[PDB]
Protein backbone atom coordinates (compact mmCIF):
# COMPACT_ATOMS: atom_id res chain seq x y z
CA UNK A 1 0.00 0.00 0.00
CA UNK A 2 1.17 3.52 0.91
CA UNK A 3 2.12 5.27 4.14
CA UNK A 4 0.04 8.15 5.53
CA UNK A 5 2.07 10.25 7.94
CA UNK A 6 -1.16 11.27 9.67
CA UNK A 7 -2.19 7.60 10.03
CA UNK A 8 0.72 5.14 10.26
CA UNK A 9 0.15 1.40 10.39
CA UNK A 10 1.70 -0.57 13.24
CA UNK A 11 3.75 -2.80 10.93
CA UNK A 12 5.20 0.35 9.31
CA UNK A 13 7.28 1.20 12.42
CA UNK A 14 10.74 0.53 11.01
CA UNK A 15 13.54 2.91 10.11
CA UNK A 16 12.95 2.20 6.42
CA UNK A 17 9.23 2.98 6.49
CA UNK A 18 9.36 5.83 9.03
CA UNK A 19 12.09 7.34 6.86
CA UNK A 20 9.46 8.05 4.18
CA UNK A 21 7.64 10.46 6.54
CA UNK A 22 10.54 12.86 6.99
CA UNK A 23 9.52 16.46 6.32
CA UNK A 24 11.96 17.18 3.49
CA UNK A 25 10.83 13.99 1.74
CA UNK A 26 7.41 15.63 1.30
CA UNK A 27 8.90 17.87 -1.43
CA UNK A 28 7.12 20.99 -0.13
CA UNK A 29 9.56 23.91 -0.45
CA UNK A 30 6.73 26.41 -0.82
CA UNK A 31 3.09 27.13 0.03
CA UNK A 32 3.39 27.20 3.83
CA UNK A 33 0.01 26.58 5.38
CA UNK A 34 -1.97 27.79 8.36
CA UNK A 35 -2.19 24.96 10.91
CA UNK A 36 -6.02 24.81 10.99
CA UNK A 37 -6.29 23.67 7.38
CA UNK A 38 -3.37 21.27 7.92
CA UNK A 39 -5.31 19.45 10.66
CA UNK A 40 -8.70 19.88 8.92
CA UNK A 41 -8.70 16.10 8.27
CA UNK A 42 -8.37 14.88 11.87
CA UNK A 43 -10.51 14.15 14.91
CA UNK A 44 -12.04 17.24 16.51
CA UNK A 45 -10.42 16.33 19.83
CA UNK A 46 -6.93 16.03 18.32
CA UNK A 47 -7.62 19.28 16.44
CA UNK A 48 -8.41 21.13 19.67
CA UNK A 49 -5.28 19.64 21.27
CA UNK A 50 -2.89 20.56 18.45
CA UNK A 51 -4.42 24.04 18.30
CA UNK A 52 -3.98 24.25 22.08
CA UNK A 53 -0.23 23.57 21.74
CA UNK A 54 0.36 27.00 20.11
CA UNK A 55 2.87 25.60 17.64
CA UNK A 56 5.18 27.68 15.45
CA UNK A 57 8.17 26.88 13.24
CA UNK A 58 10.69 27.60 16.00
CA UNK A 59 9.42 25.32 18.79
CA UNK A 60 7.78 22.59 16.68
CA UNK A 61 10.96 20.52 16.48
CA UNK A 62 11.16 20.68 20.26
CA UNK A 63 7.54 19.56 20.66
CA UNK A 64 8.41 16.70 18.29
CA UNK A 65 11.42 15.84 20.45
CA UNK A 66 9.37 15.85 23.66
CA UNK A 67 6.58 13.47 22.59
CA UNK A 68 7.03 9.77 23.37
CA UNK A 69 4.41 8.65 20.81
CA UNK A 70 6.09 7.84 17.48
CA UNK A 71 2.77 8.32 15.67
CA UNK A 72 2.47 11.74 17.32
CA UNK A 73 6.05 12.59 16.34
CA UNK A 74 5.41 11.59 12.72
CA UNK A 75 2.17 13.58 12.69
CA UNK A 76 3.87 16.70 14.09
CA UNK A 77 6.61 16.15 11.49
CA UNK A 78 3.97 16.20 8.75
CA UNK A 79 2.64 19.39 10.34
CA UNK A 80 6.19 20.74 10.19
CA UNK A 81 6.45 19.94 6.49
CA UNK A 82 3.25 21.80 5.62
CA UNK A 83 3.75 24.67 8.10
CA UNK A 84 7.52 25.21 7.70
CA UNK A 85 8.64 24.49 4.12
CA UNK A 86 11.46 27.05 4.10
CA UNK A 87 12.78 25.92 7.49
CA UNK A 88 12.58 22.32 6.26
CA UNK A 89 14.54 22.90 3.04
CA UNK A 90 16.86 25.65 4.31
CA UNK A 91 19.77 23.21 4.56
CA UNK A 92 20.00 22.36 0.84
CA UNK A 93 20.65 25.93 -0.33
CA UNK A 94 24.41 26.24 -0.84
CA UNK A 95 24.62 29.33 1.40
CA UNK A 96 22.14 29.38 4.28
CA UNK A 97 22.13 29.99 8.01
CA UNK A 98 21.43 26.29 8.59
CA UNK A 99 24.07 25.31 6.03
CA UNK A 100 26.63 27.49 7.83
CA UNK A 101 25.74 25.88 11.18
CA UNK A 102 26.18 22.43 9.63
CA UNK A 103 29.49 23.49 8.04
CA UNK A 104 30.78 24.67 11.41
CA UNK A 105 29.84 21.33 12.93
CA UNK A 106 31.65 19.46 10.15
CA UNK A 107 34.84 21.52 10.47
CA UNK A 108 34.76 21.02 14.26
CA UNK A 109 34.47 17.20 14.23
CA UNK A 110 37.51 15.05 13.44
CA UNK A 111 36.91 11.69 11.80
CA UNK A 112 39.28 8.89 12.73
CA UNK A 113 40.43 8.40 9.14
CA UNK A 114 40.97 12.16 9.02
CA UNK A 115 43.12 12.02 12.16
CA UNK A 116 45.25 9.27 10.61
CA UNK A 117 45.20 10.66 7.04
CA UNK A 118 44.34 14.38 6.91
CA UNK A 119 45.35 14.47 3.23
CA UNK A 120 42.30 12.39 2.24
CA UNK A 121 39.58 13.96 0.12
CA UNK A 122 36.79 13.68 2.71
CA UNK A 123 38.90 15.50 5.31
CA UNK A 124 39.62 18.29 2.83
CA UNK A 125 35.91 18.52 2.00
CA UNK A 126 34.86 18.82 5.64
CA UNK A 127 37.62 21.26 6.69
CA UNK A 128 38.62 23.45 3.72
CA UNK A 129 35.58 22.73 1.50
CA UNK A 130 37.74 21.35 -1.36
CA UNK A 131 37.81 17.97 -3.16
CA UNK A 132 34.10 17.46 -2.41
CA UNK A 133 33.41 15.60 -5.70
CA UNK A 134 34.71 12.05 -5.24
CA UNK A 135 33.01 8.74 -5.94
CA UNK A 136 32.49 6.02 -3.35
CA UNK A 137 34.94 3.89 -5.34
CA UNK A 138 37.75 6.43 -4.92
CA UNK A 139 36.89 6.48 -1.23
CA UNK A 140 37.07 2.68 -1.29
CA UNK A 141 40.53 2.46 -2.86
CA UNK A 142 41.78 5.16 -0.52
CA UNK A 143 40.23 4.30 2.87
CA UNK A 144 39.38 0.59 2.66
CA UNK A 145 42.74 -0.12 4.30
CA UNK A 146 41.65 2.14 7.15
CA UNK A 147 38.16 0.79 7.86
CA UNK A 148 37.91 -2.82 6.66
CA UNK A 149 38.26 -5.24 9.55
CA UNK A 150 38.22 -2.51 12.23
CA UNK A 151 34.88 -2.31 14.06
CA UNK A 152 36.15 0.20 16.62
CA UNK A 153 37.29 2.73 14.01
CA UNK A 154 34.17 2.14 11.92
CA UNK A 155 31.84 2.79 14.86
CA UNK A 156 33.98 5.76 15.89
CA UNK A 157 33.52 7.59 12.59
CA UNK A 158 29.94 6.32 12.29
CA UNK A 159 28.87 8.08 15.48
CA UNK A 160 30.37 11.33 14.19
CA UNK A 161 28.48 10.98 10.91
CA UNK A 162 25.35 10.44 13.00
CA UNK A 163 25.95 13.73 14.84
CA UNK A 164 26.48 15.74 11.66
CA UNK A 165 23.36 14.28 10.06
CA UNK A 166 21.64 14.80 13.42
CA UNK A 167 21.96 18.49 12.69
CA UNK A 168 21.06 18.17 9.00
CA UNK A 169 17.55 16.76 9.47
CA UNK A 170 15.88 17.73 12.79
CA UNK A 171 12.61 16.36 14.13
CA UNK A 172 11.77 12.87 12.90
CA UNK A 173 15.13 12.48 11.16
CA UNK A 174 16.99 13.18 14.40
CA UNK A 175 14.83 10.59 16.17
CA UNK A 176 15.69 8.02 13.50
CA UNK A 177 19.40 8.83 13.80
CA UNK A 178 19.27 8.43 17.58
CA UNK A 179 17.49 5.09 17.08
CA UNK A 180 20.21 3.92 14.68
CA UNK A 181 22.92 4.98 17.14
CA UNK A 182 21.14 3.16 19.97
CA UNK A 183 20.68 -0.09 18.02
CA UNK A 184 24.10 -0.15 16.23
CA UNK A 185 22.05 -0.98 13.08
CA UNK A 186 24.23 1.22 10.92
CA UNK A 187 23.12 -0.19 7.57
CA UNK A 188 19.63 1.27 8.14
CA UNK A 189 21.36 4.65 7.72
CA UNK A 190 21.02 4.09 3.96
CA UNK A 191 17.31 4.87 4.25
CA UNK A 192 18.21 8.35 5.45
CA UNK A 193 21.26 8.92 3.23
CA UNK A 194 19.63 7.48 0.11
CA UNK A 195 16.76 9.95 0.46
CA UNK A 196 19.20 12.83 0.95
CA UNK A 197 21.63 12.42 -1.97
CA UNK A 198 19.44 13.55 -4.94
CA UNK A 199 18.12 16.39 -2.77
CA UNK A 200 21.74 17.49 -2.32
CA UNK A 201 23.00 17.94 -5.88
CA UNK A 202 23.12 21.74 -5.64
CA UNK A 203 25.33 21.60 -2.52
CA UNK A 204 28.70 20.11 -3.45
CA UNK A 205 30.02 19.69 0.09
CA UNK A 206 26.83 17.96 1.21
CA UNK A 207 26.89 15.72 -1.86
CA UNK A 208 30.47 14.66 -1.15
CA UNK A 209 29.77 14.08 2.53
CA UNK A 210 26.80 11.82 1.74
CA UNK A 211 28.91 9.99 -0.86
CA UNK A 212 31.47 9.33 1.86
CA UNK A 213 28.64 7.91 3.97
CA UNK A 214 27.70 5.62 1.08
CA UNK A 215 31.26 4.32 0.91
CA UNK A 216 31.75 3.86 4.66
CA UNK A 217 28.53 1.90 5.13
CA UNK A 218 29.98 -0.68 2.73
CA UNK A 219 33.14 -1.34 4.74
CA UNK A 220 33.90 -5.02 5.35
CA UNK A 221 33.20 -5.16 9.08
CA UNK A 222 30.81 -7.12 11.29
CA UNK A 223 28.59 -5.33 13.80
CA UNK A 224 26.12 -6.66 16.37
CA UNK A 225 22.72 -4.99 16.63
CA UNK A 226 21.58 -4.29 20.18
CA UNK A 227 17.84 -4.70 20.92
CA UNK A 228 15.21 -2.20 19.80
CA UNK A 229 12.78 -0.39 22.10
CA UNK A 230 9.89 0.00 19.62
Amino acid sequence: TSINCKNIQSTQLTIEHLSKCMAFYQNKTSSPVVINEIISDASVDEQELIKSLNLNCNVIDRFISESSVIETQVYYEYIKSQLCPLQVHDIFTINSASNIQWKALARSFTLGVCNTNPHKHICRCLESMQMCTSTKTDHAREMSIYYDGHPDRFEHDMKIILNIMRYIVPGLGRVLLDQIKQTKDYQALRHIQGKLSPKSQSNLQLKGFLEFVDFILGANVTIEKTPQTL
Epitope: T110, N115, T116, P118, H119, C123, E127, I145, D148
Partner: antibody
Framework: EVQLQQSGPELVKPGASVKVSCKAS????????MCWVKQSHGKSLEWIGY????????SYNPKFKGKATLTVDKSSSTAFMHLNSLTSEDSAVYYC?????????????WGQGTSVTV | DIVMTQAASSLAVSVGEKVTMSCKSS????????????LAWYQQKPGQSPKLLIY???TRESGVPDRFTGSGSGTDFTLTISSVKAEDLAVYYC?????????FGGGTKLEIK
Protein backbone atom coordinates in the same frame (compact mmCIF):
# COMPACT_ATOMS: atom_id res chain seq x y z
CA GLU B 1 60.00 -5.06 25.68
CA VAL B 2 59.02 -4.49 22.04
CA GLN B 3 61.47 -5.90 19.50
CA LEU B 4 61.68 -6.04 15.70
CA GLN B 5 64.36 -8.39 14.33
CA GLN B 6 65.29 -8.33 10.64
CA SER B 7 67.01 -10.83 8.35
CA GLY B 8 70.76 -10.82 7.81
CA PRO B 9 72.54 -8.83 5.10
CA GLU B 10 71.93 -9.57 1.43
CA LEU B 11 74.27 -9.39 -1.56
CA VAL B 12 72.28 -9.80 -4.78
CA LYS B 13 73.45 -9.42 -8.37
CA PRO B 14 71.36 -6.97 -10.43
CA GLY B 15 68.21 -8.50 -11.89
CA ALA B 16 67.37 -10.90 -9.05
CA SER B 17 64.89 -10.58 -6.16
CA VAL B 18 65.41 -10.44 -2.39
CA LYS B 19 62.99 -10.90 0.52
CA VAL B 20 63.50 -9.37 3.99
CA SER B 21 61.83 -10.60 7.20
CA CYS B 22 60.69 -8.58 10.22
CA LYS B 23 59.84 -10.53 13.39
CA ALA B 24 57.68 -8.67 15.91
CA SER B 25 57.63 -9.29 19.66
CA UNK B 26 56.27 -7.56 22.74
CA UNK B 27 52.99 -6.32 21.24
CA UNK B 28 49.94 -7.50 19.29
CA UNK B 29 51.16 -7.68 15.70
CA UNK B 30 47.76 -6.95 14.10
CA UNK B 31 47.01 -3.78 16.10
CA UNK B 32 49.94 -1.82 14.61
CA UNK B 33 50.78 -1.79 10.94
CA MET B 34 54.24 -2.25 9.42
CA CYS B 35 56.15 0.51 7.65
CA TRP B 36 59.20 0.03 5.44
CA VAL B 37 61.84 2.70 4.89
CA LYS B 38 64.64 2.78 2.32
CA GLN B 39 67.72 4.61 3.60
CA SER B 40 70.45 4.97 1.01
CA HIS B 41 74.05 5.18 2.16
CA GLY B 42 73.51 8.93 2.12
CA LYS B 43 71.52 10.64 4.83
CA SER B 44 68.32 10.29 2.77
CA LEU B 45 65.33 8.53 4.35
CA GLU B 46 62.57 7.35 2.02
CA TRP B 47 59.13 6.04 2.96
CA ILE B 48 58.36 2.92 0.91
CA GLY B 49 54.95 1.92 2.20
CA TYR B 50 52.95 0.31 4.97
CA UNK B 51 50.77 -2.76 5.40
CA UNK B 52 47.94 -3.43 7.87
CA UNK B 53 48.53 -6.98 9.17
CA UNK B 54 44.83 -7.42 10.02
CA UNK B 55 43.53 -6.14 6.66
CA UNK B 56 46.39 -7.51 4.63
CA UNK B 57 45.83 -4.37 2.55
CA UNK B 58 48.77 -2.19 1.58
CA SER B 59 49.67 1.37 0.63
CA TYR B 60 52.88 2.12 -1.29
CA ASN B 61 54.79 5.27 -2.07
CA PRO B 62 54.27 5.88 -5.82
CA LYS B 63 58.07 5.69 -6.16
CA PHE B 64 58.34 2.09 -4.93
CA LYS B 65 55.03 0.68 -6.21
CA GLY B 66 56.80 -1.43 -8.81
CA LYS B 67 59.94 -2.27 -6.86
CA ALA B 68 58.48 -3.43 -3.52
CA THR B 69 55.80 -5.88 -2.39
CA LEU B 70 54.82 -6.24 1.28
CA THR B 71 53.23 -9.33 2.84
CA VAL B 72 52.70 -10.70 6.35
CA ASP B 73 52.32 -14.00 8.18
CA LYS B 74 50.23 -13.37 11.28
CA SER B 75 51.00 -16.77 12.82
CA SER B 76 54.74 -16.16 13.28
CA SER B 77 54.12 -12.38 13.58
CA THR B 78 56.40 -11.64 10.64
CA ALA B 79 56.36 -8.98 7.90
CA PHE B 80 58.10 -9.52 4.57
CA MET B 81 59.39 -6.99 2.04
CA HIS B 82 60.10 -8.25 -1.48
CA LEU B 83 62.24 -6.39 -4.02
CA ASN B 84 62.30 -7.54 -7.65
CA SER B 85 64.52 -6.53 -10.58
CA LEU B 86 67.19 -4.94 -8.39
CA THR B 87 69.35 -2.23 -9.98
CA SER B 88 72.06 0.21 -8.94
CA GLU B 89 69.60 2.48 -7.11
CA ASP B 90 68.21 -0.33 -4.93
CA SER B 91 71.50 -0.68 -3.01
CA ALA B 92 70.53 0.63 0.43
CA VAL B 93 69.67 -0.28 4.02
CA TYR B 94 66.01 -1.14 4.63
CA TYR B 95 64.24 -0.48 7.94
CA CYS B 96 61.08 -1.99 9.41
CA UNK B 97 59.17 0.26 11.80
CA UNK B 98 55.94 -0.06 13.79
CA UNK B 99 53.07 2.39 13.37
CA UNK B 100 49.80 3.04 15.21
CA UNK B 101 46.79 4.53 13.44
CA UNK B 102 45.98 6.77 16.40
CA UNK B 103 49.26 8.64 15.90
CA UNK B 104 49.43 9.10 12.15
CA UNK B 105 52.40 7.35 10.56
CA UNK B 106 54.82 8.19 13.37
CA UNK B 107 57.09 5.22 14.05
CA UNK B 108 57.97 4.44 17.68
CA UNK B 109 59.88 1.12 17.46
CA TRP B 110 62.31 0.41 14.62
CA GLY B 111 63.88 -2.82 13.46
CA GLN B 112 67.60 -3.43 13.23
CA GLY B 113 67.81 -2.74 9.49
CA THR B 114 69.00 -4.90 6.61
CA SER B 115 71.74 -3.88 4.18
CA VAL B 116 70.80 -4.86 0.61
CA THR B 117 73.76 -4.48 -1.75
CA VAL B 118 73.61 -4.66 -5.55
CA ASP C 1 54.30 15.95 -2.65
CA ILE C 2 55.83 17.72 0.36
CA VAL C 3 59.59 18.32 0.60
CA MET C 4 61.31 18.78 3.98
CA THR C 5 64.46 20.92 4.20
CA GLN C 6 66.72 21.07 7.25
CA ALA C 7 68.92 24.06 8.04
CA ALA C 8 72.32 22.42 8.61
CA SER C 9 73.74 19.21 7.18
CA SER C 10 75.93 19.15 10.28
CA LEU C 11 76.57 21.47 13.21
CA ALA C 12 79.37 21.27 15.77
CA VAL C 13 78.88 22.15 19.45
CA SER C 14 80.78 21.65 22.69
CA VAL C 15 79.39 19.50 25.49
CA GLY C 16 76.92 21.36 27.70
CA GLU C 17 76.00 23.98 25.08
CA LYS C 18 72.41 24.62 23.96
CA VAL C 19 71.67 23.75 20.34
CA THR C 20 68.79 24.46 17.95
CA MET C 21 67.95 22.73 14.65
CA SER C 22 65.39 23.68 12.02
CA CYS C 23 62.97 21.70 9.87
CA LYS C 24 60.94 23.56 7.25
CA SER C 25 58.13 22.17 5.12
CA SER C 26 56.72 23.06 1.71
CA UNK C 27 53.09 22.88 2.86
CA UNK C 28 51.51 23.68 6.22
CA UNK C 29 51.45 20.54 8.37
CA UNK C 30 48.67 21.78 10.69
CA UNK C 31 45.25 20.10 10.48
CA UNK C 32 42.80 22.65 11.88
CA UNK C 33 40.10 20.17 12.91
CA UNK C 34 42.31 18.52 15.55
CA UNK C 35 44.84 21.40 15.76
CA UNK C 36 47.78 18.96 15.53
CA UNK C 37 50.95 19.46 13.50
CA UNK C 38 51.78 16.24 11.64
CA LEU C 39 55.52 16.30 12.27
CA ALA C 40 58.07 14.13 14.04
CA TRP C 41 61.71 14.15 15.12
CA TYR C 42 64.06 11.16 14.99
CA GLN C 43 67.55 10.59 16.41
CA GLN C 44 69.82 8.18 14.52
CA LYS C 45 73.06 7.38 16.33
CA PRO C 46 76.05 6.19 14.25
CA GLY C 47 75.37 2.89 12.51
CA GLN C 48 72.03 2.41 14.27
CA SER C 49 68.29 2.63 13.55
CA PRO C 50 66.40 5.92 13.88
CA LYS C 51 64.84 6.41 17.31
CA LEU C 52 61.60 8.35 17.66
CA LEU C 53 62.21 11.53 19.65
CA ILE C 54 59.12 13.71 19.24
CA TYR C 55 55.69 13.21 17.67
CA UNK C 56 52.99 15.78 16.88
CA UNK C 57 55.91 18.31 16.91
CA UNK C 58 55.51 18.86 20.69
CA THR C 59 54.85 15.58 22.52
CA ARG C 60 57.99 13.53 23.16
CA GLU C 61 57.94 9.73 23.29
CA SER C 62 58.28 7.91 26.59
CA GLY C 63 61.90 7.44 27.56
CA VAL C 64 63.08 10.59 25.76
CA PRO C 65 65.00 12.88 28.14
CA ASP C 66 63.65 16.19 29.38
CA ARG C 67 66.44 17.98 27.49
CA PHE C 68 64.85 17.45 24.07
CA THR C 69 62.09 19.94 23.24
CA GLY C 70 60.22 20.47 19.99
CA SER C 71 58.10 23.35 18.84
CA GLY C 72 56.65 24.97 15.77
CA SER C 73 53.56 25.21 13.62
CA GLY C 74 52.41 25.58 10.04
CA THR C 75 55.61 25.04 8.07
CA ASP C 76 58.29 26.09 10.59
CA PHE C 77 59.54 23.62 13.21
CA THR C 78 62.57 23.51 15.49
CA LEU C 79 64.15 20.95 17.82
CA THR C 80 66.03 22.32 20.82
CA ILE C 81 68.52 20.52 23.08
CA SER C 82 69.08 22.10 26.50
CA SER C 83 72.53 20.88 27.56
CA VAL C 84 74.10 18.60 24.96
CA LYS C 85 75.76 15.44 26.28
CA ALA C 86 78.30 13.15 24.66
CA GLU C 87 75.64 10.49 24.02
CA ASP C 88 73.67 12.86 21.76
CA LEU C 89 76.07 12.99 18.78
CA ALA C 90 73.92 11.72 15.92
CA VAL C 91 71.87 12.52 12.80
CA TYR C 92 68.50 14.12 13.51
CA TYR C 93 65.69 13.75 10.98
CA CYS C 94 62.22 15.19 10.74
CA UNK C 95 59.18 13.64 9.11
CA UNK C 96 55.87 15.02 7.88
CA UNK C 97 53.00 12.53 7.98
CA UNK C 98 50.44 15.04 6.70
CA UNK C 99 50.39 14.45 2.94
CA UNK C 100 51.07 11.32 0.91
CA UNK C 101 53.67 10.00 1.10
CA UNK C 102 55.49 10.71 4.36
CA UNK C 103 58.65 12.61 3.49
CA PHE C 104 61.83 13.22 5.45
CA GLY C 105 64.40 15.96 5.76
CA GLY C 106 67.98 15.74 4.64
CA GLY C 107 69.01 15.29 8.27
CA THR C 108 71.09 17.43 10.59
CA LYS C 109 74.24 15.87 12.01
CA LEU C 110 75.09 17.03 15.52
CA GLU C 111 78.88 16.68 15.83
CA ILE C 112 80.55 17.16 19.22
CA LYS C 113 83.81 19.01 19.89
Amino acid sequence: EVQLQQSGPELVKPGASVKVSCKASGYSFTDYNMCWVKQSHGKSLEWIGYIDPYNGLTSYNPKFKGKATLTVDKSSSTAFMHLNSLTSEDSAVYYCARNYYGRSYAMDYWGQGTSVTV
Amino acid sequence: DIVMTQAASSLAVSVGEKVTMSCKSSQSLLYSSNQKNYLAWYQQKPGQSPKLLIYWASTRESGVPDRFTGSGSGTDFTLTISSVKAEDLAVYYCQQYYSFPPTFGGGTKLEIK
